[PDB]
Curated annotation (Swiss-Prot):
Name the UniProt record assigns to this protein: Manganese ABC transporter substrate-binding lipoprotein PsaA
Membrane topology: Lipid-anchor
Effect after changing I117M: In strain: NA-1383/97
Organism this protein belongs to: Streptococcus pneumoniae serotype 4 (strain ATCC BAA-334 / TIGR4)
Family according to the record: Belongs to the bacterial solute-binding protein 9 family. Lipoprotein receptor antigen (Lrai) subfamily.
Pfam family for this entry, one: ZnuA
Additional note from the record: Zn(2+) can bind to PsaA but cannot be transported by the permease into the cytoplasm. At high Zn(2+) concentrations, Zn(2+) binding competes for Mn(2+) transport impairing growth and rendering S.pneumoniae hypersensitive to oxidative and polymorphonuclear leukocyte-mediated killing.
Length: 278
């Protein structure tokens, strides 16, 4: 079987939906762990050295700061666009502070379904190139999978489009939902920007509180992977309730709600639409 390594659980789950039991798949950053700041373990190092195909997010998710993925593939003597591929190739990239330059790419592309589809297409392309005997199987699975994502995308867009505009704002701790905002037409507000050193200071909290007091946003949200105390303070100061916890960069544990890329996105889109339509 083709040996495949995926850098995190979102990419791994999308790969499973295309490849099924045709491959030997290993994922590095486990479910619920931090895919930006991660230290690969010996099993990760060995699997990556042995891999036929390696899939990563790109757009600075795993290559910024400590650049763990760069170190991993360099020590494994693997080659870009031969052994490893960025599943985000072809996404319409958003840049931190709207400054178009290498290294300022916002990594959170998968939070709109059109990009999840791009991820799936890139995975299918490279699986088919390395394993031509299972090409028609991968293509069949791709068409089914992308139809499922497209259907959810269109339904979610219809829901957000019905919400009164004054109420449409996605408030989270970190500004990690800009791709969601772009696709679904729900502007973002947040406590701290991506790659902010100090997260949840009194000054950041006050700044957001004062912005929100001038809106009619009915609900706030909080990421399941962050310390919720800054968002709880914002909720207290604005009297706007936190409606739900939402996923950012991981699927849920196996058997739980949101335990696939599809289920994760369905949960997020449905909860954000619900919370805002109240």
């Amino acid at each position: 079987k083709l040996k495949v390594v995926a850098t995190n659980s979102i990419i791994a789950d999308i790969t499973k939906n295309i490849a099924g039991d045709k491959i030997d798949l290993h994922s590095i950053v486990p479910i619920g762990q931090d895919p930006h700041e991660y230290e690969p373990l010996p099993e990760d190092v060995k699997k990556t050295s042995e891999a036929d195909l390696i899939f990563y997010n790109g757009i600075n998710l795993e290559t910024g700061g400590n650049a763990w993925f760069t170190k991993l593939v360099e020590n494994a003597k693997k080659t870009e666009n031969k052994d490893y591929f960025a599943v985000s190739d072809g996404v319409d990239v958003i840049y931190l502070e709207g400054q178009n330059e290498k290294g300022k790419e916002d990594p959170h592309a998968w939070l709109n379904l059109e990009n999840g589809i791009i991820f799936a297409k890139n995975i299918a392309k490279q699986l088919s190139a390395k394993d031509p005997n299972n090409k028609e199987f991968y293509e069949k699975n791709l068409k089914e999978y992308t139809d499922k994502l497209d259907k959810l995308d269109k339904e979610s867009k219809d829901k957000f489009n019905k919400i009164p505009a004054e109420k449409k704002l996605i408030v989270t701790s970190e500004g990690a939902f800009k791709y969601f905002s772009k696709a679904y037409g729900v502007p973002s507000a947040y406590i701290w920007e991506i790659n902010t050193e100090e997260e949840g200071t009194p000054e950041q909290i006050k700044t957001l509180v004062e912005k929100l007091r001038q809106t009619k946003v009915p609900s706030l949200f909080v990421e399941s992977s962050v310390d919720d105390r800054p968002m709880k303070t914002v909720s207290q100061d604005t009297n706007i309730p936190i409606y739900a916890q939402i996923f950012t960069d991981s699927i849920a544990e196996q058997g739980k709600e949101g335990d696939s890329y599809y289920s994760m996105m369905k949960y997020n889109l449905d909860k954000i639409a619900e919370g805002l339509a109240k």
